[PDB]
Amino acid sequence: QNNTNSPYTRYGYGDLSDQSFGNSKAMGGIAFGLRDGAQINPTNPASYTAIDSLTFLFEGGVSLQNMNISGGGLKLNAKNASFDYLAMQFRLAPWMAMSVGLLPYSNVGYTVSDSQTTDNGLAYSRSFTGDGGLHQMYVGAGVKVLKNLSVGVNASYFWGDITRTRGMFYPGTSSYDSYQRKMVTSISDYKLDFGAQYTQALNKKSSLTIGAVYSPKHKLNNDYTSIVIMGASSSSYGTEYKDVLDATFELPNTFGVGFTYNYDKRLTVGADYSLQQWSKTNFGVVTSDENVRQDFNETFTYCDRTKISVGAEYIPNLIGRSYFAHIKYRLGAYYTTPYYKIDGKKASREYGVTAGFGLPVPRSRSILSISGQFVRVKGLETNMVNENIFRVSIGLTFNERWFFKR
C-alpha cells in the first residue's frame, strides 16, 4: 500500500507503473522518440548517446496522489505517496553511453473490508487485502552505428513478491478460530529490452526523430504458494497448512513506436503508440484442488494493453535575462486500455491530462521537474468502480562536470 489503493490491483500483476522520468511524466509519456540530452530516459535504450561529453547525470523522483473512488452510490477518497525512479548515466566514448538504475514495474495495493449480520443473530466480518509488487534493476548501453542512427539494450534483473489474503472474523465471539488464505507469488528472473532511434535534419534548423522499442515474450522462474492460516489471533500465530504449486508466469511481446519534431531548440512536439500482447500469454497452474485452480485462472487473466500519448515542451528566449525565459513549459495527454479482464469482458478504460515545468538551477545544469497529472479510470460494466486520481511529481536531474582531466 505504498503505490496504489485501486481495487483493480487484485487482478494480474497489479497495475503497470510507467517508468516515465520527469520530462516525460509532464509530456504525457512520449518517451520512445525523445532525445532530450539533459535528462535520463530508460524507456528507449538508444536515447543514451545524447549526453554531453564531460557530464554525469543522477536522476530521482517522488510523487503524491489523491484517489477519489466511487461506485454504487458510495463515495470515498484515499491518499498515498510513492518512489518512482532512480538512475545514473554517463559516457564511455565519443560514440557510446551507459546507464544503471532502479525502476518499478507493477504494484498492488488494496484493503477492501466488510461487516455483516445473519438472520440468526451472528455477526461476521470479512477482509480482503493485498501487498507487494514487481521491481526491475537494469544496466544498459547505447551506441552510434551511423551518424544518424543509434541502438541500445537494457539487461535487467526482475524480481518481486505479490501477496493476497482473504479473512473471516467474528467480532464479539468469545473464542473461535479465524480463517485466512494467503496466496503468494515470488518471482526472480531476467528481462531484455531493445531499442533504436534515427534523427533527420529537416530544413537546417529543425530535426525530426523516430524511435522504436521491443522486448520479447518470456517465461518466469517463480515460487507460487497457497497458504491457509487457521486460528491466528492477537496473541497466537495459529497453524499454517502450506501448499506449493507448479505455476507458470509470463511476460508478453511488447512493441512501441513514436516520433518527435524539434525546432530551433526552442520547441518539441511528439506522439507515441505502444501495444503489449497480454492476451497471447499462457498463464496456468496444475493442482488437484479445483478451488485454487479456479482462483488462479480467474485472477491471472489478461487482455491486450494499448497506449496512445501526445505531448510537447516549449522554452522561450533562453538567452534573455529573465528567469521565466529559462523555464521549460510542458503539456501532454494520453489514453490507455488497461489489461484487466473481469468476468469475461474487458474491465476499464482510462484518460489523462498532464502539465509541468522544467525549473533550472542558476550557475548549474541541474533541473527540478515539478509536474502534475489528472487521470480518470472509467469502469465499463455496472458493478465496477470509477476513479478520479490527481498527482504532483517532484524530480531532480543532478548534473555535474565529472570526467574532466588536465
Binding site: T173, Y176, D177, S178, Y179, M230
Partner: protein, 53 residues
C-alpha cells in the same frame, strides 16, 4: 444406593453427583455435521451445559 438409583431415573434433568455418584452422558450429532457441512472449514464448535440454582 436407592436414592441414587431413583435420581438417575429423572427425565426432566441430569445430575453430576461427584463422589462416585452420577455422571451425565451426551450424544453428539456427528453424522448430521458430516452431512450438512461437508466442504466447509469448521471455525468453532460450541457445546454448553447449564444448570439450576
Amino acid at each position: 444406593p436407592e436414592r441414587i438409583d431413583a435420581l438417575i431415573k429423572e427425565d426432566k434433568n441430569t445430575y453430576l453427583k461427584s463422589p462416585a455418584g452420577i455422571f451425565t452422558e451426551a450424544t453428539l450429532p456427528i453424522s448430521d455435521i458430516q452431512n450438512e457441512l461437508t466442504g466447509d472449514t469448521l471455525n468453532a464448535v460450541k457445546l454448553t451445559f447449564t444448570n439450576y440454582n
